[PDB]
Write an enzyme that holds these catalytic residues in place. Sequence first.
Site, PDB file in Angstrom:
ATOM      1  N   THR A  55      -5.979  -6.333  30.045  1.00  0.00           N
ATOM      2  CA  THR A  55      -5.368  -5.888  28.755  1.00  0.00           C
ATOM      3  C   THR A  55      -4.574  -4.767  28.828  1.00  0.00           C
ATOM      4  O   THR A  55      -5.151  -3.604  29.356  1.00  0.00           O
ATOM      5  CB  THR A  55      -6.486  -5.878  27.841  1.00  0.00           C
ATOM      6  OG1 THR A  55      -7.215  -7.139  27.448  1.00  0.00           O
ATOM      7  CG2 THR A  55      -6.034  -4.860  26.498  1.00  0.00           C
ATOM      8  N   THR A  56      -3.338  -4.746  28.308  1.00  0.00           N
ATOM      9  CA  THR A  56      -2.483  -3.580  28.176  1.00  0.00           C
ATOM     10  C   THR A  56      -1.842  -3.461  26.866  1.00  0.00           C
ATOM     11  O   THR A  56      -1.350  -4.304  26.368  1.00  0.00           O
ATOM     12  CB  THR A  56      -1.351  -3.579  29.313  1.00  0.00           C
ATOM     13  OG1 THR A  56      -0.705  -2.532  29.231  1.00  0.00           O
ATOM     14  CG2 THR A  56      -0.640  -4.751  29.551  1.00  0.00           C
ATOM     15  N   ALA A  95      -5.624  -8.250  35.034  1.00  0.00           N
ATOM     16  CA  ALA A  95      -6.275  -8.458  33.539  1.00  0.00           C
ATOM     17  C   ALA A  95      -5.390  -8.557  32.496  1.00  0.00           C
ATOM     18  O   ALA A  95      -5.872  -8.775  31.411  1.00  0.00           O
ATOM     19  CB  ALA A  95      -7.313  -7.436  33.364  1.00  0.00           C
TER      20      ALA A  95
END
Lengths: 214, 123, 238, 142, 202, 204, 206, 218, 230, 235
Positions: free
Chosen positions: E1-2, E169
Amino acid sequence: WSPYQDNGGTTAAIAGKDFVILAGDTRLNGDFCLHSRHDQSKIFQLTPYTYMASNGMQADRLQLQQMLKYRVKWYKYNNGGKVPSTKAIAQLMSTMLYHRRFFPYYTFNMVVGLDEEGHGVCYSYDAVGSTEPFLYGTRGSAASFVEPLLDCLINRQHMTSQAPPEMTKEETLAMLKNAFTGAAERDIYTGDSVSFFIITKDGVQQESFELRKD
Amino acid sequence: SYDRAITVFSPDGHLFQVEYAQEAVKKGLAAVGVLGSDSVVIAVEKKSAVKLQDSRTIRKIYKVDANIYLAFAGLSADARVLINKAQLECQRFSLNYEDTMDVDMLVRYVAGVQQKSTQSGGS
Amino acid sequence: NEYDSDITTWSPTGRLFQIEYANEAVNNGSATVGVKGKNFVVLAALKRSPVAELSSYQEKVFEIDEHVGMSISGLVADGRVLARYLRTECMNYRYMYSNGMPMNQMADMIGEKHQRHIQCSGKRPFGVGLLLAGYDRQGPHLYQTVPSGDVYDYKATAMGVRSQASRTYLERHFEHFSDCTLDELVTHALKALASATSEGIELNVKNTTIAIVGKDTPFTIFEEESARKYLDGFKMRP
Amino acid sequence: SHRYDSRTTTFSPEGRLYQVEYAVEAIQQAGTVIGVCTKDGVVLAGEKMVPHPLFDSESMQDKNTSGEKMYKIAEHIGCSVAGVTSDAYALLNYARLSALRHQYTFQEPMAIEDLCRILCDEKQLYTQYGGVRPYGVSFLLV
Amino acid sequence: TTTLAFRFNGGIIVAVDSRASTGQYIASQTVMKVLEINDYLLGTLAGGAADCQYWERVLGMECRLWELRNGSRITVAAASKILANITYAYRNHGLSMGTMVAGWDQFGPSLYYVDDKGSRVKQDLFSVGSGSIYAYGVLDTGYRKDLSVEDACDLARRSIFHATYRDGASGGIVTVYHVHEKGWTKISRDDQTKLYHRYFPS
Amino acid sequence: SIMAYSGGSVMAMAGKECFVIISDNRLGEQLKTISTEVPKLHVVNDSIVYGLTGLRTDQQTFANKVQFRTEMYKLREERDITGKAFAAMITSMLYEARFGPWFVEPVIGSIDKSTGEVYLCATDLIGAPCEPEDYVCAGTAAESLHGMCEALWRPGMSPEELFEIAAQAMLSACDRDSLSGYGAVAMIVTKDKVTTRLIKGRKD
Amino acid sequence: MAETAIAFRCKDYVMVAAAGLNAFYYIKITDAEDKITQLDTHQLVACTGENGPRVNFTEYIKCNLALNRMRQHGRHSSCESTANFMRNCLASAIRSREGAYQVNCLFAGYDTPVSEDDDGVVGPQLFYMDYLGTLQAVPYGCHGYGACFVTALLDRLWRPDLSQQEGLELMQKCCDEVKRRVIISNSYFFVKAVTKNGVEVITAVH
Amino acid sequence: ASGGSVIAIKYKGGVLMAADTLLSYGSLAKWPNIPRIRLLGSHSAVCATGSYADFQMMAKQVEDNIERQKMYHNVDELSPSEVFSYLHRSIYQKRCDFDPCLCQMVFIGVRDGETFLAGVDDVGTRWEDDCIATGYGAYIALPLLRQALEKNPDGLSRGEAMRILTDCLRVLFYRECRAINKFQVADAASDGVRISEPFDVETHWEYEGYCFEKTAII
Amino acid sequence: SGHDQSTDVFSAEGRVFQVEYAGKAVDNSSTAVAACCKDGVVVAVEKVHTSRMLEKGSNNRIHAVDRQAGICICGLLPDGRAIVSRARQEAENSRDIFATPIRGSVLANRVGEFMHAYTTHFAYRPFGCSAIIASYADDGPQLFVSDPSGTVAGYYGVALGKAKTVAKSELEKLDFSSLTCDEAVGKLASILHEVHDKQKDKLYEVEVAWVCDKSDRKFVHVPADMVPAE
Amino acid sequence: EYDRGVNTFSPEGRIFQIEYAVEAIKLGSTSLGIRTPEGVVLAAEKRVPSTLVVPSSMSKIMEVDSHIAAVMSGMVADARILVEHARVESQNHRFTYNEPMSVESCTLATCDLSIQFGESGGRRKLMSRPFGVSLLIAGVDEKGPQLWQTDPSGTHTRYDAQAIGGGAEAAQSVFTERYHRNMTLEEGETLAVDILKQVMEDQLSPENIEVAVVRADDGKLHMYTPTEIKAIMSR
Ligand SMILES: Cc1ccc2nc(C(=O)NC3CCCC3)cc(Nc3ccccc3)c2c1
């Protein structure tokens, strides 16, 4: 002693243009034995157009089904007999799953049904209620075996060819039957028989599909 | 605890306790507020110079908050309790939202407190 | 009278006047009629008619469970409270035993709930009467509750304003209710309800609700659209 | 029963609280005490009841904390009472507790006005809440 | 997740990926990491998805109640303070949520970062999530206040893409929102692989 | 441990009609000296002097509670509290938090202004009293203080001799302790007067 | 502890400085975050700790001081009173369910005569505060990894009668030492001062 | 005190449920004359594997509920399905309170023709089938019961069910450590549930490979 | 005056008038009789109906409290239902805490204590019903009566209600030593039929229950075809 | 007077406090409500105590939600509690079900709050008296435009055209005529304005009354400004 137990099993939903195909494997097993080959508690009807499917603990999903049913009945009482919609039930499921955030249900749930326009929609949740909508989805022990297959045949990615026409009820049912047949030959905790619920505006129909018994 | 209904309706649709509180207000010192283009003026009756009061001045207009000031007519002790409640509400507001309470927000809070005083048993 | 201002005060003749006043409140509500057949129970409720253009709606008939429903008469708020309590108890029972509550146990629970509010100083009786229509393993049931807490098991009954006419009409056809079919039961209930209306008002769909419960029939309410089958053809023939 | 409730904390048709007025009338019959606030000190002078020949003095050490009419709230606070003495003792204890609590929290002497305000809210509370009689006592704080 | 969000002369730019990975397996590739609190406030998804969703829904309900009671919109300072207070009340309850509140109230644009332990910081640039270490490198190098709306959107999209390219991720579809004085608009929603082929042709 | 986090040592010694109570000056955080001018003595009245040792925040909280209690006692009871009553009150206060204990260890010295009898007390953190007739001591240098007092104390000391013995014992005990030192502060309490002195120590 | 706070009191002023570091486990979120909260006109606190507890504690203390000023008709509280109030709050926190405030404080202030009858403190005041509820009046105090590095430096160089400019140079030296000897990057130090005229934000030293 | 395994099978006309009459305390065979099958209502029976105190308390709670409901109100007696539903809800409620009923219960019943057979765990899991087993009967007896059921899907006669039940009891006595050769079978039929007197099965220990010389380790 | 408005007030002559008013309300209720026959207890009540459309068994006044114990209500029926609920709670407490059926005297004492507690507080009013407790416990057949005042008395034969004196006089003609429940049922039904006025209570039914050896010491209602027609 | 309790029944069967609170409604300002297939219209008489009062500070029509408005008559101080409760319940319904709350459900919640009055403390603190407020809740939901009326007894009633306050009977008499099932929104607005004219002691001005409309097609609430009220009058 632990208050949790995983009973295995897998569920899978695919949302069509004016229908939803829900499916759950009818198999309940204990620590190492097999409680039953005809457990029908995985799929629960909330409204004539909305269904829920749960994986994981059997007792937890029974309790959750009772809570959802009574909340829906209270909603019907408080809204003049108006049955709640699929999205309302999805939000209610998320809220009630999050309410038990510190002693979570050991259930992984999917809420399926028709939208206001009649188009089928699927919702998936974690243990604590993180809802996310989608057109298909698989939960349980064999999710990792069948979800990539649904990804390849539906999204048609990495294919230098024209997209085939959108699938009807029969083709979707056949695809899901193939997915469960493939899962039952590689996953040891799923597969005695699969219950299919085809949900359209003209009622809901139920079908039973045979799998291997080993 | 004592929670007997004190403010009750009368056969003519009147709340006698509220009317008696209003009559107690009618016997209080007068106060006027005037709204201008860029200023608000509050004047109070400042009962008298008894020649026995302290030489130090005490204000009859009370600073509820840095931007909000209050004047009252009626019972002094109930007014002090209400002003303390308003000051505590302003501080709680500026501690839960980091913003200073608007005048209308505080006025609504005070009016709500006064309303609850007319519908709480034993009070 | 100095013995009617409190609920915990006994009259010197052995009476409780507050409960009698609650009964009087029940006697001033809209007329309703309950009829019990061999397999079905039919309730008929007389709702307010529009004033020539203005249709006011107020919910009097409630659905308590799949097999149970009721009709209220009197204080609507008390009826709503009792409906909420009955629905909660039915939901609790169906959760524990996976089946509907029996009607006798339900009537006992309503009676106990009524009695809980007629002996404490800080309480007042429910100014509403109820007609309970249900079905269980023991067959059809029809109960009537009063603010005093008494629950009457009835073959057929009525309550509300000018309901004595409905009762005296029902006292002529009730012994045959065990043989009349569902349609005949509905017609009898409609005639009883019409016996309680005023001089210049005839029963029609705009001002009548019909509730039905049976052996294979969940408690179903019938109103403007669905009541055409029972009220469009209907007239009182003396 | 509610029949015998005297309804102490209720308004009258004139907006006046009869219990408060009766307490004021009660204080009118108490012994007179006069306070004079000068620039180099404050003096309290009060009339005490005629000494009976059989009265005995409590042989207290530290003869500066409480007299027959005048009491010490804190090292920097004193008071005189007029009215129900038994009601005055409870309020004096409450005032001492409040002053010592303020000293506990801030390690500074409590302001005289703050102590006067804190024990006035106690008296006001009984005129709006509780359904009991108020305190029939007036304080002169120095 | 970014996730990232930065303030520039022209408003605020928010950018997200759309990947949720339950450990090693990819749960979904269509997650909505920008949570539209209102038509004038935006929130971000990072950490426990359920915690963020539930508590920013609570925040939106409180903002709507504030508008109804007071007749005017809530400020971003007050909206971020509500979330920070709620989170601080639950700091010992094992919440996992890192969000950004970005909005344009009557005092111009404003951006806050609120963690799962009650922290609430107000700066002009934030990157949150496991891929933030990759976003910052692309984001701090090209960020300047006098950026155009198109330039700021391009910078945010490029930073999110570079986060998704190296972080396992992070991934999915890069989504870019712009918050201005009139509210917010969903600027863009582009696939990450198509972004790679656009930024590195041939 | 928590009791040695802040350092500090206190010791009371009994004369004939007098007692000397002495405390070190160091306040630190487990190795690091925050300040070198923090005495641990407290005066209750003309007859009672007590010191606290342990966690410094607990020392301050307990001292505030004791001040509250003694002021309330002097207001209610028109008299100064006595040493035995004060020690009993501290014992009760410490035992109230028997399972949530304060991290202090008081050392109380008192004298009767009319009689001259000397009363010493030193309770545990839960209030277990200890009333000998020679000396009490608490702190990080408790063992060294005990040894020095056992080796130097005699029954019939004068205030000056008692002060010298207490100062020597305190300094020698602080020399062997890394959490105590930086001079000392002593209070000599007699029947007629009270003297306060500050005693040179190592700056180590 | 990662962020270093410095404070020293002179004859006419108290200078405090607080590192503006904010981090997530190795990532510098920002390096300009003011950790010095002004409580009153002549009072401030430099607080070290994570953002949540620090902000909550400082806002609680400031709001309570403002409420007291409101209920006391604008009577400003002395530095000792405010310091004891903060100490009581911190000490009460360590025995409560929600736990202790993980905040270390350097409380600085200047006491002025509130009225002509006042006879209290007139010079500047500085207080060291541990998170457990320790309170100590010190000529200078420090928190964080660099604290010891500064403290000895102050023991070498601090004088009671330093001027404002020489105090500024001393604070610059302390900040340089912290940057030189601490592995944790404290680039910016947010210096403020309290004098008889109130609180000044000094930008020369950083 | 702990109970051994319980088995049960539905036959064409009713249900049979067998269990040994033994309570053990660890590895100690403490009491060999315990009636473990308890009758609930006038239609049902129950037997629990595991803790005997928890089973005693739960059975008392369930039996009080049936009789009091039948007595206090003029209502029909609870159906076996309703009794099992109440039992399952009570067990699950105990589990959610972190005070579980550490038993695995087999429940049988018959009313007016319909046969009910079910099993419930200590944590709230419930299921219904034509054959149920708890404890080591789940691993030992249950495969044999399933095979016997599937060799004739039209239904087992009472004699056929009794034969395979005794075979499973014999195998359980062979292969379960905490067991004795003394069993009771409760038969739930239309007229009601009847518990038989304690009996034993005949065993075989005379295999030629069991002799001293063939099993010796020289 | 105000000396009869609440139960917490004694009169000048030492009386509690609210309890007397509740007893007067009991005295205006339908007649009930009961007999202890040295082998069991038989209770018989008359139920007056204000409607001819009532289902059979409506307004039951006899309720089983335990297996061997039952209570008949003479007076306000809802108050009797509350008393029956309390008695059922008392009976099951004995079976759960002490693992024994509650003795008839013990149950009667509990009922009397429960009824008396409502005659001592200003916030409550006394029950407007009398309770007839018929038990066949380990202490033999027992027949008790609990007064709205809370006093309990054991009887061989007892009558309550409006037609009380005449029913008591008819009960005085029985022997109660040679009397058996089989004939006692008929005797009580005949007494109730004879003492009832036929011109004021048009709709009347006789409800009879008993607990003796013939029912395995279980408190049940009579078989339908056992009471006389009239 | 405290001779009778607050839970006592009249010999006719009516609760004295509830009947006394009803008479307080007739002492309040007049409020209107019109239901039409195009939407629902709320009208209210402001009755400001003085010309120095800011007319917007005495809003007789309050917004419960973007699709639900409420106009009160009687004691405006008590009406604030009811409107706040309705707002909280509507926001809770939106939070839980992700859908606008129905008008009937909002009225149900309002009456549920209203009924909770009495004197017995026990476990829950009840209100010493009923609300002296009658509410008129208008909205648009899946069942089209809906108008409901709330009483101090806690009884909700769905209406087609209801009026509360001092000029209630005259407004009803006008309602018997001049009204049908399928009026247009403009016709309903003109009817409301004329009815306010007929029952107002003061002269009608754009700032003298308050008008709001919830449109069926839009589905949103629209507070009318004085110029819009003048435009209605100029027709
Ligand atoms: C302002 C900021 C900057 C960097 C942040 N970085 C990570 C993060 O997970 N970094 C990874 C681990 C170390 C390197 C990669 C997480 C953050 N907030 C957060 C997210 C979810 C829940 C709670 C807090 C951040 C917030």
